[PDB]
Design a protein around this ligand. Structure first.
Ligand code: 4DE
Ligand code: MG
Ligand code: ZN
Length: 326
């Protein structure tokens, strides 16, 4: 079919920043996570390396994708597919050439795929404030992120879904630990501390004569992987403007729905969640200035000069959003 053909053509850009992820979601019948993960696993030769049966991978991916909510505007399967593909590009940065093992690459990609699974479209603070069952289960700490991990790992136990069946016990244990460490680091409450430690690493940075990073112990390696997936999660403002604007419309819809629930329950409405007192453009400039730019500038310093084009796009988009404010 022409549709299958156009999908294949779009997937040829899987190694590029700015992949048309929304078009892929449309052309695949709302299966961007499955088709992008499959494409990346084939590109990196991960099925052969880890002896993953192809039918098992597709079965797991479709099941995982089914556990992202189709009625959540932002934290859905499209976001998951986007974070996966963004991580995949960051792993190919010349400064990280041959730095991570195949197991570490597998961990970072799998963590990205599951990192928001079963997201209900409300924040950790909302779940805590409403005395939710999730906040009760997880003692108010990294409530969503613990849940995303539990669901992502539990789904491996469904029929023909154990993609790690042929890993050794030691490999399985190492991969599990890494995935947990990465997904827990996507909790925004940990952003300031992650960034501070990234800055410390940049200052004491050790590289070869070609600028390839030298990371020997687990502490430094996992820290770079955590910040990599965190950067991917917070990559929307560094993408081509047309994509960024669609991501902004989606998060604003999700936020406004949370604010509607807060308003009716008599709760104070969270920042950016009040559709009657919103300033979307000012919020984007604030988000870039206080969170996204500080993070990406630091990442760019770590892999200098490989992330220059990403930082340039971020600055271009900040300038555009600022121009929309009278
Ligand atoms: C266009 C997408 O970017 C956002 O506006 C955005 C996203 C995603 N997350 N947050 C965000 C919300 C709360 C928070 O505090 C926990 C940190 C970031 C913002 C502003
Ligand atoms: Mg999350
Ligand atoms: Zn996310």
């Amino acid at each position: 079919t022409e549709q299958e053909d156009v999908l294949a053509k779009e997937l040829e850009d899987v190694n590029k920043w700015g992949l048309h992820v929304f078009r892929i979601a449309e052309l695949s019948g709302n299966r961007p996570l499955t088709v992008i993960m499959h494409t990346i696993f084939q590109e990196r030769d991960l099925l052969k390396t880890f002896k993953i049966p192809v039918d098992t991978l597709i079965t797991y991916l479709m099941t995982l994708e089914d556990h992202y909510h189709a009625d959540v505007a932002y934290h859905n399967n499209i976001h998951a597919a986007d974070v996966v593909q963004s991580t995949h590009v960051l792993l190919s940065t010349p400064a990280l050439e041959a730095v991570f093992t195949d197991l570490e690459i597998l961990a970072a990609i799998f963590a990205s795929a599951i990192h928001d699974v079963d997201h209900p479209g409300v924040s950790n603070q909302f779940l805590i404030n409403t005395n939710s069952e999730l906040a009760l289960m997880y003692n108010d700490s990294s409530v969503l992120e613990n849940h995303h991990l539990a669901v992502g790992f539990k789904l491996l136990q469904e029929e023909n879904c154990d993609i790690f069946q042929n890993l050794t016990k030691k490999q399985r244990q190492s991969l599990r630990k890494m995935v947990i460490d990465i997904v827990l680091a996507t909790d925004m409450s940990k952003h300031m501390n992650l960034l501070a430690d990234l800055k410390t690493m940049v200052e004491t940075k050790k590289v070869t004569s070609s600028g390839v990073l030298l990371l020997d112990n687990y502490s430094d390696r996992i820290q770079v992987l955590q910040n990599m997936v965190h950067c991917a999660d917070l990559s929307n403002p560094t993408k081509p403007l047309q994509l960024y604007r669609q991501w902004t419309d989606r998060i604003m819809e999700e936020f406004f729905r949370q604010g509607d629930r807060e308003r009716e329950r008599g709760m104070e409405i969270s920042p950016m969640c009040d559709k009657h007192n919103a300033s979307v453009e000012k919020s984007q400039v604030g988000f870039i200035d206080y969170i996204v730019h500080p993070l990406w500038e630091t990442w760019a310093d770590l892999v200098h000069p490989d992330a220059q084009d990403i930082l340039d796009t971020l600055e271009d988009n900040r300038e555009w959003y600022q121009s929309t404010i009278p």
